[PDB]
Design a binder for this molecule. Structure first.
Ligand SMILES: [Mn+2]
Lengths: 248, 929
């Protein structure tokens, strides 16, 4: 990984490399985020998912193959990450996220940045509660299922301003019932979210999950570097800007 | 008659894998000598089991040193036990057998325990009783004959071992592991002192007897509360030990009295399991039983070790040397097998236990025995869908004449030969697929042949008896429907010529009992059990060549006329168990097994030995493809062998090839109105979101991803996973350490390898039926081959880093009116807020590489209507860096555009709007049907 160091300072490069991130719910915007992180140069990862991959999980994550069906999600994701970078520090957790288990929460506060991608809203609100109570830096992605639009993309806003997305509204209601309404960050589209018909649905327009993966990648890179406004780092490291015509 | 009374002093390799303890033995029996433990390697300390199964057998072979060629069996356990351990052991025994041509002997764990506790003991006659301990199967069985075990009693609630462990925990006197607690509790009996202490203490005892056979656990439940609060409770331990011994000996002597009353009296009191170390129990049993002698094996042969499996396999192989000849088939890995006939308290009390008259000498089941009888020419009577069959091997004049004499031979008549396979029919009719007209008979096979369809094939050679034919065309070779008949014919040779069982003037065969009565005095192998042969309405003759329908039956010419071709005229099978066909991959089968087992239903899976059900299938049947695989006959055999009342459902995985299993058997099984399960496709969520026809259209689409230095590789991943079919690549370069970030299809052990090849093999791995037409080649001036393939292909999306190649391809596309969208500027950008745009390049803002391409296209001559993907954000000069989010974002935008083009009218927007029943916009949730 040298083009990133060509872009941003090396100090930031080994700040990200000496970075620890925990990913919950590898059944959506998490596993592609895992690929992006391990290729960017991220070190410790905190994968946490008890399910096994399916063909729908095959279309979701890059770390999968028709020969990998029914294999544990964490196993496939970790082996692919190690293939990308043998020097990695992947950590298997399993640890289904029913609202009773909290040793994974012990490991969570042990970590640095917590990424939430739990497909179950109950698990999502449990993680948000735990992180808010322990003041941990948490990013709660509401996924990208049932979304269609691409002109407007996911942007990191507070849970107070969460809107439109059905999952975002459900998590907002659950958190307000629990008593927290502004502490946690979130990643929402603010775009059309079809409800479809009861058949269980899900959604999964293929570009939308990679939309979410890219946005989560960007936010994880923002928070993994020691707070410096990495835009400022590029400004002080690069030469041209090229907004209107080009500024040195 | 259990140690050694046979010739052929054989050495057997026993492997046991049912419980946590893994053991392998090389026992040797035979001649007139006691068995000798040549090697007894074992490990008690599943992934660990599968890891250790091979080192243990290898080390046992090394230590034995007798010879890997002297071993004549690989006898392994398939009886009750942990399912994963059973699969590992069986999958380790079958590997050895296949690699070294040794017959495989499946044995039962309980039978193994009984026989191992029967080892040594100088002489032990076979009429002996067993007291199987060490598990939740504390059973009283009587070994009337080898394989004739009758289960007199079984513990209804709990075993003595659990009670001893619970009492030890209550007293905290574990003192080791497993039976060590029981050893300590038995040691605690101090005779007079503990008896006086118990007399002083209150104690408690209330088993009150459980029916007559056996059973008790209330004493342990009372003892839990008795010893939870008390302190020094040596007297309580002595009391519970004495009460357990009293119950055991009482039920044992009751069973002995009952069996001596109504059946053959026992000659030993073999006790298995870990309770045999109980000195008090042994003394009480010896004092109580009297004439019958108590047999107690050493504890080394009680903790589920390989010696029992070796000895049981040895006894089975010696008893029936004709069986277990050379080939393993019917490898059924059960989880709850039991040990034979059940009688229990009431049937033991009344005494006779029903009755089977000597007239009813029908040898039910034992399909292998009937198959060998047919091979030797012995007459075998088996049931079919039509009249109860009675026949022998076709390629034997003596056998068919014997059949005729058995039924009296009123005449010869046309005699139908029953055949069950594709290969046997071809071989017996005319070989080499008969002629070019065989395309109709194969269709008849795949449509109706299992059942009452009588293909009057005109023969062509092979070997047929003159008596069976009674004409120039051979009589109507037919697949029967009764699964026993299909199994017998599959295990038979060329075919089975079974006219009928009609020795009397009025046949009325119907059930197996009636035909057995009609043939009380005969020289025949036996009669198989009747499974519903009462539907004797005959079949339909369907002469293949001149499609002529002779005397007809159930099938009727209407459905034989599926494609007309003229129809000149001159119920069905039903498994008792809920058979379910699983369509998809092995992963979906394992997921279905796990999920359905978690629902409480117990499952029986039918799969070839190559497959591997995960851990949770109750009974696993391995087809063991040996000859040429199911072909229907193996599938019927497996279905019959898993029709046990225990199993709730049977899962059969229909392979996508659907070539070996060519028959209507799977079609009939899947037609049970819910028995068919289809794995959700890779685009299952996509087909949920947009119509199936839309996803099919995307699949039929083509893409011409150019140089994959930029967003080409992620785009290829997205397209392949989304369902795109034909693709093309135009990047003749090799990956590098820096290139690793932009490639999702890359590993550190891939550097300097061709990028196009890596992407192609990853795409083929994700989708097998993915048509890739790798072009390679550099910018390729004049792109003649590239131009022709662009004509053949569809949207020609490019990510060429070289500005010249990009503009050359854009010029070609605009001059030839081909659909094009580019990406150009994707690196050196920082902000992800706006790095996504689909605009014509004439409208493109700074995106510096977009300006470069703009100038070059303006110099080329035309720039109005070519699409592009510009950032519209911040393009830092940096005196060619990248932001990892930005490349994947651009890949997502390119994927969106590709699927918009590959959709058609108004694309995914109107497609979902027609499909979806409601939209949650930025204001409210509007619903439109
Ligand atoms: Mn056992």
């Amino acid at each position: 990984t040298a083009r990133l160091e060509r872009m941003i300072g090396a100090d930031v490069v080994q700040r990200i490399a000496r970075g620890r991130v925990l990913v919950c719910g590898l059944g959506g915007a998490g596993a592609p985020l895992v690929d992006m992180a391990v290729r960017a140069g991220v070190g410790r990862l905190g994968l946490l998912d008890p399910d096994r991959v399916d063909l729908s999980n095959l279309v979701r994550m890059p770390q999968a193959t028709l020969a990998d069906v029914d294999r544990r999600k964490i196993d496939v994701v970790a082996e692919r990450a190690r293939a990308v970078n043998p020097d990695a520090d992947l950590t298997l957790l399993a640890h289904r996220i029913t609202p009773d288990f909290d040793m994974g929460a012990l490991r969570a506060h042990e970590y640095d940045i917590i990424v939430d991608a739990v497909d179950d809203p109950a698990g999502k609100v449990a993680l948000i509660k735990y992180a808010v109570e322990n003041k941990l830096p948490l990013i709660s992605c509401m996924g990208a299922g049932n979304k269609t639009d691409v002109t407007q993309v996911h942007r990191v806003v507070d849970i107070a301003d969460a809107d439109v997305c059905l999952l975002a509204l459900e998590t907002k209601r659950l958190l307000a019932k629990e008593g927290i309404t502004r502490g946690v960050k979130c990643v929402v589209t603010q775009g059309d979210h079809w409800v479809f018909a009861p058949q269980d649905v899900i959604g999964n327009w293929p570009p939308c999950y990679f939309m979410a993966a890219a946005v989560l990648l960007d936010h994880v890179l923002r928070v993994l570097a020691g707070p410096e406004s990495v835009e400022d780092h590029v400004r002080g490291r690069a030469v041209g800007v090229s907004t209107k015509s080009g500024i040195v």
